[PDB]
Amino acid sequence: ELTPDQQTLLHFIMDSYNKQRMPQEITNKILKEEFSAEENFLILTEMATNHVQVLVEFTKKLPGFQTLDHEDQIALLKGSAVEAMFLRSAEIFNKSGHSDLLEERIRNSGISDEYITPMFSFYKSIGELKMTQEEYALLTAIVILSPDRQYIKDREAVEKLQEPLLDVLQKLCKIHQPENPQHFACLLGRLTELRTFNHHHAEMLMSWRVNDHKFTPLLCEIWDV
Amino acid sequence: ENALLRYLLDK
């Protein structure tokens, strides 16, 4: 279990992943700020925007990513943004006593329950897998380097960067959870659950209590507003 | 197109 090049590849993913943190001035707003729908929405907005900064930073350092066509690199970034961002938020909800105040801000932010409800099911669903940091990081690379996104010119080039990340992730599922032989398969299933938010997202973008807000620049650009 | 995302990728 563990291959020299696979360790090298993992160490490289982790160097990059651990750099990615939610800034404390943002989390302080969760505790400090006035409680209403507008101010709550503004908070989530800042956090979403930060999701993108971090994931652009991660995407950039991914092994092989600079060797891809400049168009294709953008197609993968915009392609994976929604999936990637929800995943990161789930990591930052499951892994203090602030989850509670954040949840309450989320549920009193003018977003209707048809979106909020499966956000939280997903968080529970992924939280039951008890994933290590290393599993999260590889999953995130696996999502980001999906060959199945809209507009990719050279899909096979993307495939050949994704495949080794799946091989490593599978070994990590044996290493971290040997008790649970169906654990890797179970992570692939949560990716199925994760892809459903591409439709939940496209709808919200449309919705009146989501379209009549002016999203930060990075947001308008990544989400094709 | 995508000047912002291009800037952020090349830094």
Ligand SMILES: COC(=O)c1c(C)nc(C)c(C(=O)OCCN(C)Cc2ccccc2)c1-c1cccc([N+](=O)[O-])c1
């Ligand atoms: C401001 O919210 C949006 O308009 C939005 C859009 C148009 N698109 C995406 C992809 C995300 C999104 O990525 O969520 C992640 C939740 N983030 C924003 C907050 C958070 C951070 C850490 C832990 C929990 C939540 C968010 C979003 C989407 C659906 C449901 C919710 N919600 O339940 O709060 C938010």
